[PDB]
Symmetry: C2
Subunit: 469 residues, 2 copies
């Protein structure tokens, strides 16, 4: 029977790019932990400004105060500088980020505050330094691990672009050599990595481009071993698109729901979306949508997966891969507030991208959020998160479209007695809706957010509200 | 005040090339420890014959029975296949050898039997996969570790021999990129590696080509930190030649005494040395020596270093780097027995190269000794080791040349009351010596080995003996 972690159904996730989050407020002995202070100046690399895991641990005050109870990262394992997606050693948190020691301290500091931590697993490819590929570059045909990868001919040309690489790399890039997952050895190796970190204490896995590993039975085994070590462990696939193939209950607990992000932005932002700023590969926040259109595709999205899994989906509006919220919408604040509102009132776990909560800009490849806040946008986030953690219906309640006409959208979230009405007016003019709400046994008349069985609801332009009771 | 480990002064060392020592007598789950047996056949690399650390642990019976009480290895850290001297990760025992787990079991099994273990430290250079060099190959000029190595210009050509590497490699080889030890960071990194394994439990360090690291103060610091973790830890430099520079008491406890090996072989083997089989870079077992000549250069070698250090020298007759004993002497058994005799009766710790003890051949680049023994040569070894562990004088006693004329050599080892006379007749004919031995207070007349104050000693051709009392 389909079962997903319960803590996830009630969590608020917060995606961090550690390299560019926060510096520690203290001089840190990263890498060379034994080095004495007198030598500090002699050591240029240690002495002299990127973000690290110390930093995040130090800013747990801020993160918790925002209302966050679970942070998940981009890839943090040892890898070359500015290339965290080209794994060198999966068993080691990168030295510059503070290594396993710094990670262990952050991990404990988080758990002490009851904040979960999920890591990114880049298992489709590694790097040219990854040990077993290293052995292949050194021994060629004689290397015993040739069959661990996808070699096409000899000789290989790892670094000289003037000659054919002769081995398959992600997106045709030599620095991203792919794994031969069909090989039961490669598979066993991936599984053992997954198990290790769960034993270490992480609260589960983000899966990078998991749809590339096509070996049948691969992800069910992944789920089996994973849950074996931690039955409450959260397995999220980063998949852009219909993810039914992996959401049958035997693989992931959910995916990063870009199917939610596209329509939500296309409706809240409308024709204000800055096209040259949309990572069209991930989501489609265009063409602009009218209330009735947002309503049908949203319901279509809500009946795509089993309800238990829908509740553990990772809803988002941005990621390391896309532009920030303020940027995708040409600085239109209302687009941010309206979008965030739909995000924090959607069934499934919400995910806030670090920086968005302070109105920080960001195109498709900026950081250090705690360094000019957009107070308004910040308050919208904190307040909405408090409200989501205050009413169970907003987390695991059902979802009912009440009204969707023109540019005005109304739906209700209900759990037992609790009934909440959420309204969105994406239009440039004030609007009112007359609705026959006989599906509700109460009459939500109290404003829990914003300003505003027969109901007459009037909303100001580009505004949303939450009605309680 | 100069002080070296005491256990070393009474140990008998046994040099092993793990890859080619012994296979485990059991199917082993190296690398993928979690893999289930049903998959064994699906895993070609695991299922299908090199030596490993399991194997050595299983053959501790044999090693201890030989009389060995300390084994030291060639490089065993993670590295490409057939290239153990090109380190990939210093913090990991190579997967194929059984990893840290297998090493941990061998380490404990040895210590339970009171047998020490010394590892080889290759700190002058690493490999192209070594993480920080990896970062340099990936980021070039922008890599933050450029100054960790010896880059000469851009761009670098790591694997394409048709273009200049542009970075310094050991002996001009690109696969062996050198470290910039002058960099206090590189140095701190080396030191931390050294400390780690000592904390792990190893009984000290063999230092590979340490004379290449010229940074002043480097080896004194190495000694300081090392002994800090384990005051009884054995620091041996692999240096071929006058090692006074490093044997002043602030650096090594001793070196692999090739200054002993050269003359010893040149005398015991004489013109039977097979020139095309001598690694002339390490030692010079030519031209052949007459007794009187062996005597003067041996005394010259015995007054080269402080006595406390001479007692912890690692005397040997062969290494991974040279030809085996049976091979260097054209299969002349007497050369082996005579040489081994001089080795086991010399002041300082003796080192036996695995295979030599069974007459195994070996040119300058064969293994698996426990697989046709030369019983005679084996008995000579075991017996001589038993005799060395039986009389303290043979270990830490003084050294006095009694007679050296023609092809007949006599010396005594004395400790307190104990006085031992060792005789060598390298000649092809029977010989007798008349000596005035007034330096001794006893008259050694008992044969403890071999067949034979005024003394008349007669020795058969190509033979040696030990006289007790």
């Amino acid at each position: 029977q389909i079962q997903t972690p319960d803590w996830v159904k009630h969590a608020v996730f917060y995606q961090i790019f550690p390299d560019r989050f926060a510096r520690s407020k203290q001089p840190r002995k990263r890498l060379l932990q034994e080095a004495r202070w007198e030598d500090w100046d002699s050591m240029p690399t240690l002495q002299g400004k990127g973000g690290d895991l110390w930093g995040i641990m130090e800013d747990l005050d801020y993160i918790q105060n925002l209302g966050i109870n679970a942070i998940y990262f981009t890839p943090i394992f040892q890898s070359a500088s500015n290339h965290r997606y080209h794994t060198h050693d999966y068993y080691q948190v990168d030295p510059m980020l503070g290594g396993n020691e710094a990670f262990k301290e952050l991990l404990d500091a988080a758990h002490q505050r009851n904040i979960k931590v999920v890591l990114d697993g880049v298992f489709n490819h590694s790097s040219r330094g990854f040990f077993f590929f290293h052995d292949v570059l050194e021994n060629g045909p004689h290397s015993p691990w040739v069959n661990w990868f996808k070699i096409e001919g000899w000789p290989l040309s790892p670094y000289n672009g003037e000659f054919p690489a002769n081995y398959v790399g992600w997106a045709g890039n030599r620095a991203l050599p792919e794994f031969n997952h069909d090989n039961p050895e490669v598979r066993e190796y991936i599984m053992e990595i997954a198990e290790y970190w769960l034993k270490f204490g992480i609260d589960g896995w983000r899966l990078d481009v998991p749809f590339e590993i096509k070996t049948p039975g691969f992800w069910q085994e992944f789920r089996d071993r994973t849950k074996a070590i931690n039955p409450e462990a959260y397995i999220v696939g980063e998949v852009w698109g219909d993810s039914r193939q992996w959401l049958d209950g035997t693989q992931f607990d959910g995916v990063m729901n870009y199917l939610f992000a596209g329509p939500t932005i296309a409706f809240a932002a409308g024709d204000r979306v800055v096209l040259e700023q949309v990572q069209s590969r991930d989501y489609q926040p265009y063409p602009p949508l009218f209330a009735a259109e947002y309503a049908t595709k949203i319901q279509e999205v809500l009946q795509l997966y089993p309800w238990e899994i829908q509740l553990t989906q990772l809803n988002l509006l941005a990621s390391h891969d896309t532009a920030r919220l303020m940027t995708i919408a040409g600085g239109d604040i209302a687009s941010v507030e309206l979008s965030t509102l739909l995000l924090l009132t959607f069934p499934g776990a919400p995910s806030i991208y670090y920086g968005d909560e302070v109105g920080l800009p960001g195109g498709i490849d900026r950081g250090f959020p705690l360094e000019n806040w957009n107070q308004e946008i910040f308050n919208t986030h904190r307040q909405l998160i408090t409200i989501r953690q205050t009413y169970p219906a907003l987390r695991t309640g059902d979802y009912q479209v009440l009204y969707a006409q023109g540019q005005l959208y109304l739906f209700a979230r209900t759990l037992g007695t609790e009934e909440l009405i959420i309204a969105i007016n994406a239009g440039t003019s004030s609007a009112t809706a007359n609705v026959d709400v006989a599906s509700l046994h109460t009459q939500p008349n109290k404003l829990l957010y914003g300003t505003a069985q027969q109901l007459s609801l009037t909303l100001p332009a580009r505004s949303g509200c939450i009605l309680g009771t």
